[PDB]
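Field reference: "sequence" (input) and "structure" (output). Example, Green fluorescent protein:
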Amino acid sequence: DPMVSKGEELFTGVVPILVELDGDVNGHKFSVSGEGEGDATYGKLTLKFICTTGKLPVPWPTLVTTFLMCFARYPDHMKQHDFFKSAMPEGYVQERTIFFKDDGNYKTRAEVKFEGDTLVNRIELKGIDFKEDGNILGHKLEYNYNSHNVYIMADKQKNGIKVNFKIRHNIEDGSVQLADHYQQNTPIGDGPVLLPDNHYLSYQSALSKDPNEKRDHMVLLEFVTAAGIT
């Protein structure tokens, strides 16, 4: 299929990635830079993020979802359902509202596209209504992450997709902080895109630290595989 060919041929080997985030949560401002690489053949991403403005004023785990669904491994039988690749190289916009139960919310807008050979994710994040001493601004979340399936559906009237999913962040007292994610993606280009049947992406996420890095940072390894269309 010469459509499956095009986005395919952009993601076949290892692709360098750059991430840029501008953040303001309760007027606590911050910037993050990331660098790494994706290999969509294995659904594999390797990323390191650095808070360039000093201390990250929120827990690194709360930004994981915000910081590349084009690097999902779509099984051969599911290639016609891969919206994210199909929008490239012009890219797509990914928008979210993430509601932290009994605390504030993030609203994120990102543009995901190629700049030459580099896949770039430029993000703006605004957080409002957080409790200064809650789990988020009070840094009460553990530095870890659970696996989660994420259910994609077409949003045909917007020529894009919608995703809704829950993340449960572990609190240091053994409880959980729910983070209810609402998401919409739309192509940046005017060309045709693949609009998927309902399916899901299974995510596994490992957070770590670079022993040689003194700046506030996060090392992220994610494996992402599409499924649900037998």
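The first helix runs from residue 2 to 8.
The CA atoms of residues 83 and 195 lie 6 Å apart.
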